[PDB]
């Protein structure tokens, strides 16, 4: 009874982002995850330099054909994240579409990376938005947008928790049964150094489970945390199917331990009061193996 | 505290061979292994079908350039196996050369993939023009090599008909450069029957007193009547890992590497039986996590 995941995201030689942030953790948890490297770069673009090559839509299709010709196109989950190419995203769609005809129970976990905010900056060309809205989101079962992307995808601005839950409702109608807004500008009663995370899941009649978590903000900028988050949400939602509460507590806790370790190590390498380089800030992935297998819970999600 | 490994080998979407058979295990053991994917194919070439792209020497050099520009060209180990093309293999040589000027203590683990003996004769798996390159450029930069008998014969230019002749070939190989030589598999007679294959290992080192000594071992291992791809890649990855933990104990490093292979293969065999096409024989990697972490010794090497 193996669980197979096709994860189509970027690859870097040094460091952890994309498939590099998603693969080791999912393997450690027991998933037969296959990685399609959308690109292969020396390191992430947050460094002073980078070099690499990209996979084009034709090559992505060629790889799928090999899998299909061998009858190896039967997956339990599909996982996608940052893509900067309209043509590539469209091929992804055709593939998930076909994997779904092949296995109707397939769960597509989509991290709709578009940009972030007090105002916004896109990370992808503007023509991807319509594809995400019209072709990607409708195929997805789990999406993990941040506030800014939740707004973009729904066309509505979010100024509060209730408008956020209304925007998730609209996203559910677009198709996915699970929506988790991974970061927002909503205030927490816990302090200015906290942010709100909201999750919603539609699931015997039709019931809704909605949750809220208040989590500490990052005194720095880490790469690959959203890729890690999506991969972990996939794993924990798989293990605790009708419990978005526990699944998010484990996902977030796992992120906590990885970042905590990353932060201690980075400070121990940069100076005292010295802001660490992007290299020292790379996720301490391999060293958090035990936190990935069984993370100590350090957040409680409240059911709304 | 971290041990960085630069591993340049094939990548496949489905299955475990190349970087796919080498990465997860080394990450499980705590190594910061960076993978440069020399090809990206749907699955291994032992399947009825396969499609993919290959990385060329120019692209290999670009990626190295990125690591270089960020001053991330500092590794403790380099790991390589199946290489398909002369210019690619030469570029790999310029890279190891430089990593060694950067870190004179770097250990280059080289699996010199060339071919194998099938019937009355061997055949090559790569272009014949790689052989002079392995002899004159690669093997001399190598610290640990894992040839099968056929490859030890090509590299030494002497044919092997006995254990004693295998040991003389190992010495020639040591003189070419590598301080650790393992003839991972040979057609030599076993006092345990025709069902067994011989593994020979030899290591030269300077002891605390400054004396240069040599440890030699032999293992009589049972043959598996099936064709597994990726086992040579895993064996080299683990050889790297267990010689790193037991630097002056070849006997133990070898018993652990071999035992790890046994546990993986065995688990792969029970599964395959309970279902065998090449897909059925894929190494059960993620499920062998515990065995990779701390393998029960199931074979004892004899001291030569
Ligand atoms: Na995100
Ligand atoms: Na071999």
Contact A77, B23 (CB under 8 A): no
Partners of A37 on chain B (C-beta within 8 Å) are 11, 37, 40
> Among all ligands shown, which has an atom nearest to the Cα of A112?
1
Contact A279, A266 (CB under 8 A): no
Q: Measured between alpha carbons, how far is B41 from B51 in angstroms, rounded to an integer?
A: 6
Contact A63 B50 (CB under 8 A): no
Burial class (CB in 10 A: 0-12, 13-18, 19+), A266: buried
Q: Nearest C-alpha of chain B: how many angstroms from A125?
A: 25
B233 among annotated binding-site residues: yes
Task: Please name the residues in contact with B174: beta carbons below 8 A apart, sequence gap of 6 or more.
Answer: B181, B202, B204
Query: Scanning the structure block, which residue is given the tokens 């010495």?
Result: B171
Instruction: Using CB atoms, pick whichever of A51, A62, A67 lies closest to residue B14.
Output: A67
Q: Nearest C-alpha of chain B: how many angstroms from A121?
A: 26
Contact B51 A31 (CB under 8 A): no
Q: b/e for A76-96, b at 16 or more Cβ within 10 A?
A: bbbbbbbbebbebbbbbbebb
Q: Measured between alpha carbons, how far is A177 from A169 in angstroms, rounded to an integer?
A: 10
**Is B233 one of the catalytic residues?**
yes
Contact B18, B230 (CB under 8 A): yes
Instruction: Using CB atoms, pick whichever of B24, B27, B43 lies closest to residue A70.
Output: B43
What the block records as the tokens of A29 is 């948890």
Resolution value, angstrom units: 2.0
> CB distance from A30 to chain B under 8 Å?
yes
> Among all ligands shown, which has an atom nearest to the Cα of A228?
1
Instruction: Using CB atoms, pick whichever of A13, A59, A287 lies closest to residue B36.
Output: A13
Closest residue in B to A62 (Cα) is B51
Q: b/e for B114-132, b at 16 or more Cβ within 10 A?
A: bbebeeeebeeebeeebbe
Contact B261, B221 (CB under 8 A): no
3-state SS, one letter per residue, for chain A? CCCEEEEEEEEECCCCCCHHHHHHHHHHCCCEEEEEEEEEECCCCCCCCCCEEECCHHHHHHHHHHHHHCCCCCCCEEEECCCCCHHHHHHHHHHHHHHHHHCCCCEEEECCCCEECCCCEECCCCCHHHHHHHHHCCCCCEECCCHHHHHHHHCCCCCCHHHHHHHHHHHHHHCCCEEEECCCCCCCCCCCCEEEEEEEEECCCCCEEEEEEEEECCCCCCCCHHHHHHHHHHHHHHHCCCCHHHHHHHHHHHHHHHHHHHHHHHHHHCCCCCCCCCCCCCCCCHHHHHHHHCCCCCCCCEEC
What the block records as the tokens of B60 is 């290999």
Selected from 3.40.1190.20, 3.30.505.50, 2.40.50.140, 3.30.110.30, the CATH number assigned to the domain covering B1-304 reads 3.40.1190.20
Contact A32 B286 (CB under 8 A): yes
Closest residue in A to B37 (Cα) is A40
β partners of residue B69: none
Closest residue in B to A287 (Cα) is B30
Q: Nearest C-alpha of chain B: how many angstroms from A222?
A: 17
Spell out the domain ranges in chain A: 1-304
Catalytic hit among A76, A214, A227, A291: A227
> CB distance from B27 to chain A under 8 Å?
yes
B190 among annotated binding-site residues: no
A253 among annotated binding-site residues: no
Residues 54-93, chain B, touching A (beta carbon < 8 A): 55, 59, 62-67, 69-70, 72
Method: X-ray
Query: What is the distance in A from the centroid of ligand 1 to the CA of A144?
Result: 6
Q: b/e for A271-292, b at 16 or more Cβ within 10 A?
A: eeeeebbbbbbbbbbbbbbebb
> CB distance from B212 to chain A under 8 Å?
no
Query: What is the distance in A from the centroid of ligand 1 to the CA of A251?
Result: 14
């Amino acid at each position: 009874e193996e669980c197979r995941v096709l994860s189509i995201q970027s690859h870097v030689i040094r460091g952890y982002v994309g498939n590099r942030a998603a693969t080791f953790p999912l393997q450690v948890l027991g998933f037969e995850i296959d990685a399609v490297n959308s690109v292969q770069f020396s390191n992430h673009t947050g460094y002073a330099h980078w070099k690499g090559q990209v996979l084009n839509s034709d090559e992505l299709q060629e790889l799928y054909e090999g899998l299909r010709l061998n009858n190896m196109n039967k997956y339990d989950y599909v996982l996608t994240g940052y893509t900067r190419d309209k043509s590539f995203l469209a091929m992804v769609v055709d593939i998930v579409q076909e994997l779904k005809q092949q296995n109707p129970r397939l769960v597509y976990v989509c991290d709709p990376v578009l940009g972030d905010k007090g105002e916004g900056s896109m990370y992808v060309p503007e023509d991807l938005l319509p594809v995400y809205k019209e072709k990607v989101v409708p195929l997805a079962d789990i999406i993990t947008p941040n506030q800014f992307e939740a707004e973009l995808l729904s066309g509505r601005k979010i100024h509060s928790q209730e408008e956020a839950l209304r925007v998730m409702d609209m996203l559910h109608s677009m198709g996915p049964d699970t929506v988790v807004i991974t970061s927002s500008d909503l205030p927490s009663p816990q302090g200015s150094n906290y942010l709100i995370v909201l999750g919603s899941q539609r699931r015997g009649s039709v019931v809704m489970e909605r949750i809220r978590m208040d989590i500490r903000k990052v005194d720095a900028v880490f790469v690959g945390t959203g890729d890690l988050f999506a991969a972990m949400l996939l794993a924990w939602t798989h293990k605790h199917p009708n419990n978005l509460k526990v699944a998010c507590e484990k996902t977030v806790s796992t992120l906590h331990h990885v970042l905590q370790r990353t932060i201690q190590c980075a400070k121990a390498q940069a100076g005292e009061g010295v802001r660490p380089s992007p290299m020292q800030l790379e996720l301490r992935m391999v060293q958090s193996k035990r936190d990935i297998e069984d993370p100590e819970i350090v957040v409680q999600a409240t059911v709304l």
